[PDB]
Amino acid sequence: TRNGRDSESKRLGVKLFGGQAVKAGNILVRQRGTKFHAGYGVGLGKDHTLFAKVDGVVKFETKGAFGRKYVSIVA
Amino acid sequence: ATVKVTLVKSLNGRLANHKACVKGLGLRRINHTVEVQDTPENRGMINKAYYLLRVE
RNA sequence: AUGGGUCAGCGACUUAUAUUCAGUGGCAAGCUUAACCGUAUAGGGUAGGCGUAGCGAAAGCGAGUCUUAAUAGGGCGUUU
RNA sequence: UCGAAAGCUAUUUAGGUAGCGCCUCAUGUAUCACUCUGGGGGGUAGAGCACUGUUUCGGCUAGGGGGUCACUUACCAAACCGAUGCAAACUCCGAAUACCCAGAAGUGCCGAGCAUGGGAGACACACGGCGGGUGCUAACGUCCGUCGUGAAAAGGGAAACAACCCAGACCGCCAGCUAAGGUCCCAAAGUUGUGGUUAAGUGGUAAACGAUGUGGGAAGGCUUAGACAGCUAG
RNA sequence: GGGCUCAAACCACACACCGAAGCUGCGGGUGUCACGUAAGUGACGCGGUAGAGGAGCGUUCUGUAAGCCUGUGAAGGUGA
RNA sequence: CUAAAGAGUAACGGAGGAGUACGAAGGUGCGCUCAGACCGGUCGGAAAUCGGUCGCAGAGUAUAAAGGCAAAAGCGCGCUUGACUGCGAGACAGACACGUCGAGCAGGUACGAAAGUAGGUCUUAGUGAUCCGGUGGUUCUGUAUGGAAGGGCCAUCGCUCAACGGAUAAAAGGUACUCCGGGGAUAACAGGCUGAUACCGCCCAAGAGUUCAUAUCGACGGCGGUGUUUGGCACCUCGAUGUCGGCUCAUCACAUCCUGGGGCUGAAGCCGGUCCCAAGGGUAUGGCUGUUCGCCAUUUAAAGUGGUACGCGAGCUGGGU
RNA sequence: UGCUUGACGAUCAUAGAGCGUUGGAACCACCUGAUCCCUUCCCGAACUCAGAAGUGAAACGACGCAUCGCCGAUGGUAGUGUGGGGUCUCCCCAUGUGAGAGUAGGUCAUCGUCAAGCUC
Ligand SMILES: [Mg+2]
Ligand SMILES: [Mg+2]
Ligand SMILES: [Mg+2]
Ligand SMILES: [Mg+2]
Ligand SMILES: [Mg+2]
Ligand SMILES: [Mg+2]
Ligand SMILES: [Mg+2]
Ligand SMILES: [Mg+2]
Ligand SMILES: [Mg+2]
Ligand SMILES: [Mg+2]
Ligand SMILES: [Mg+2]
Ligand SMILES: [Mg+2]
Ligand SMILES: [Mg+2]
Ligand SMILES: [Mg+2]
Ligand SMILES: [Mg+2]
Ligand SMILES: [Mg+2]
Ligand SMILES: [Mg+2]
Ligand SMILES: [Mg+2]
Ligand SMILES: [Mg+2]
Ligand SMILES: [Mg+2]
Ligand SMILES: [Mg+2]
Ligand SMILES: [Mg+2]
Ligand SMILES: [Mg+2]
Ligand SMILES: [Mg+2]
Ligand SMILES: [Mg+2]
Ligand SMILES: [Mg+2]
Ligand SMILES: [Mg+2]
Ligand SMILES: [Mg+2]
Ligand SMILES: [Mg+2]
Ligand SMILES: [Mg+2]
Ligand SMILES: [Mg+2]
Ligand SMILES: [Mg+2]
Ligand SMILES: [Mg+2]
Ligand SMILES: [Mg+2]
Ligand SMILES: [Mg+2]
Ligand SMILES: [Mg+2]
Ligand SMILES: [Mg+2]
Ligand SMILES: [Mg+2]
Ligand SMILES: [Mg+2]
Ligand SMILES: [Mg+2]
Ligand SMILES: [Mg+2]
Ligand SMILES: [Mg+2]
Ligand SMILES: [Mg+2]
Ligand SMILES: [Mg+2]
Ligand SMILES: [Mg+2]
Ligand SMILES: [Mg+2]
Ligand SMILES: [Mg+2]
Ligand SMILES: [Mg+2]
Ligand SMILES: [Mg+2]
Ligand SMILES: [Mg+2]
């Protein structure tokens, strides 16, 4: 009837911020859903992990018809 | 230019980055005066720790 | 809160055997002996131990080797 | 000479221990901090009602309930409209800070950084400030975050007074200047100067509430066509 | 605490002074770096429990030592 | 959620879930878009199926919540097995052991005309180390030799080991007959802090009081004081601070029981009620009970209320404990 | 030279919605029919095919309009870093920063590539 339970913290969130150099494979965002969407050079994992497919610098952008926040890798 | 900065209050018990502001200007002890170039980077350290310093 | 009435005497990180790291020496691709022998701290004794090659569970192969269909990737190793 | 910890994780564990964190030493190696400028994400403070809940009025109106027993409404009420509030587990919004990254000057006491290795100690913390849970926004309570001090810090102030304020003691001096705090005597230093307030020893402990205490300010009503009070008479 | 009321209270402003192991002065010691292939100079340091690191004093015995000191007075004891 | 806009972050803090499911509910290609409302329509009604308009996600997503969802990640259909084997640059997370994501390469596939997509499911729970034993493979080893046994390697099975980093394959209690090492790290007494509670006082004043709020009371509410009861906390004491009650002896406070001085009275007098001032002195004896208390009897001017380690055991008692 | 139409983008409401006017030469849509390819868990509704008799009615495109929506200052306010203070459950001062709401107002988008027609 009472309380006292909780689950472990998942260490979600942004791992590389805007303007940071990235290598291919670098995890950029850990998230539950797609709070951020995969832009250019960015892949999507099973658990909606955003990861780098190319080397460059992280660029965060909001764009499109749905107002989705995008993660892209630019040169 | 160049500005005279003197440390007039003690550094004991201050915040770490305020101490690093006074230490980053070259000041070591109370009533010690340094001559630092009047630059934006030096001015930001003087402005952060203004209450510890006497600037003239 | 504890302990001591005071003095004098005594009273607690030792030793052996294995070992690692550091310092300081000997010799150096070698270094070192154990038991033992020895008119005996000498000298001999080099069986053994460590080093000079690694990888692999291992057979094994070997500056490579293991995994693997793969001489591709990757692991460990090799330029002291 | 340097110099902690009272944390995290695990534990038949909880006053033990172990890895990591924090100390020290050595070796190697090139980073680090402060600030400025630039690039970022956020969902907190605040705010708000767009969602989910919860409010209070009013209007309009289902539907429910009365009189008929086919018509009209005594009486409650969905929705909608307008006004109006609340919310840790609400958000159409949304800072400051903090955090991550890049470039740059100077300063680092000669180094900050990192790596490897030798040696630890420590894993009972406490108070104060700030942000919170809990408790009664009780406790010198309890549990977190964060900073400061004590621990492990003497000196000066707070009468005395770990944790508050100032300040970090290598040694000596019968030299000087200051900090907090002070300057009539105890007791070092103004019975200093200028302009006010208080009469309660308030100062030098407290609330709702009460009161012709007293100072200042801005307004208003009546008023030498007689104001207010007192006295006479109706 | 004494005592205090045109205050020795409160509010505002000003000029003085006191006040620490803080700062400065003078003398001394020590740590670390750098310059020194030197004596030394320069800069910055030098509160501290647990704990790490470094450098020493003293005591008994062995060697140095069949030496040296010692009855013209050793060790010990007690004063300066 | 707490959690203080990066991460993390405790409480016997506030709330909910899990110990599964699915060979399709996985892959792919193609196609589609919900809930709800209103109107019309046989049974049919609030609500079944049908048509139209609005609706624009208020639905759905196996399941709790949160975050997502149009290239829908929601729904249908055809074909399928990528819920593949070896791996794996690079990261996240992190004491370790574990954990998470993953481009790309090779082998072999599925769907599609193709570009492509596919190494399970919208995501985050659905789990258990080692040892031991079992099963399927194996070019490894095989105690003279050849075999074999046994061992190794790869795959896989057996724990509500749920106290879930799992002491053993295997385990409950009593002690007032007790004992040791410790702790004021931690309870009982007393002290302390606090003041919810307690007691005392005040504010407002509906009302009671024949009328009349305040003679006396005073609802609903509000503000304090004391330290004073029941408590909260765990700061002192566990290398020992003796307990309730009685006896003896006290000392202080005043929120006064009597005596003293007064104001108001619903004070005629006698007697009262209430409030202000006042702490000088005084302030029962018995029955019952260990009682403090209380009830009772009989007095008294009165038989006060508290603090003092609930005063007082190096002063007594020992009835209670 | 510019315009119109269509396809694909940039951007994602100041761009949307609603209302009204307008376009058929071409384009596009509605449209004709269903034997042929292909389709309906029924239905040529959609998908598909062969066309051009008819029409810009629907849709689409263009134009206009602040009714809704969306955007939105300035000033102030709230909060807040640092230092200090108070009567300290909460505030104030110095300095730095600074919303949300609301108000004034704004909006009936802007741009690019290609193809066809026309204009000049
Ligand atoms: Mg004793
Ligand atoms: Mg030090
Ligand atoms: Mg266990
Ligand atoms: Mg708020
Ligand atoms: Mg930076
Ligand atoms: Mg512990
Ligand atoms: Mg602890
Ligand atoms: Mg703590
Ligand atoms: Mg405490
Ligand atoms: Mg405590
Ligand atoms: Mg200690
Ligand atoms: Mg002091
Ligand atoms: Mg003193
Ligand atoms: Mg004097
Ligand atoms: Mg004077
Ligand atoms: Mg007073
Ligand atoms: Mg008159
Ligand atoms: Mg002076
Ligand atoms: Mg001095
Ligand atoms: Mg000094
Ligand atoms: Mg000197
Ligand atoms: Mg010092
Ligand atoms: Mg020292
Ligand atoms: Mg002797
Ligand atoms: Mg966070
Ligand atoms: Mg934060
Ligand atoms: Mg119907
Ligand atoms: Mg209906
Ligand atoms: Mg699904
Ligand atoms: Mg054999
Ligand atoms: Mg076998
Ligand atoms: Mg466990
Ligand atoms: Mg018995
Ligand atoms: Mg005992
Ligand atoms: Mg205690
Ligand atoms: Mg107690
Ligand atoms: Mg005590
Ligand atoms: Mg004792
Ligand atoms: Mg009295
Ligand atoms: Mg009396
Ligand atoms: Mg008298
Ligand atoms: Mg009696
Ligand atoms: Mg009797
Ligand atoms: Mg007593
Ligand atoms: Mg006694
Ligand atoms: Mg006795
Ligand atoms: Mg057709
Ligand atoms: Mg038309
Ligand atoms: Mg606005
Ligand atoms: Mg605004």
From Swiss-Prot, chain A:
The keyword Ribosomal protein applies. Pfam families: Ribosomal_L27 (PF01016). The keyword Ribonucleoprotein applies. One of its GO terms (biological process) is translation. GO terms for cellular component: cytosolic large ribosomal subunit. GO terms for molecular function: structural constituent of ribosome. NCBIfam families: L27. PANTHER family: LARGE RIBOSOMAL SUBUNIT PROTEIN BL27M, RIBOSOMAL PROTEIN L27. HAMAP family: Ribosomal_bL27. This is Large ribosomal subunit protein bL27. It comes from Pseudomonas aeruginosa (strain ATCC 15692 / DSM 22644 / CIP 104116 / JCM 14847 / LMG 12228 / 1C / PRS 101 / PAO1).
Curated annotation (Swiss-Prot), chain B:
CDD domains: Ribosomal_L30 (cd01658). HAMAP family: Ribosomal_uL30_B. Belongs to the universal ribosomal protein uL30 family. The keyword tRNA processing does not apply. GO terms for molecular function: structural constituent of ribosome. Keywords: Ribonucleoprotein, Ribosomal protein. It comes from Pseudomonas aeruginosa (strain ATCC 15692 / DSM 22644 / CIP 104116 / JCM 14847 / LMG 12228 / 1C / PRS 101 / PAO1). The lineage of its organism: Bacteria, Pseudomonadati, Pseudomonadota, Gammaproteobacteria, Pseudomonadales. One of its GO terms (cellular component) is cytosolic large ribosomal subunit. Part of the 50S ribosomal subunit. Pfam families: Ribosomal_L30. This is Large ribosomal subunit protein uL30. One of its GO terms (biological process) is translation.
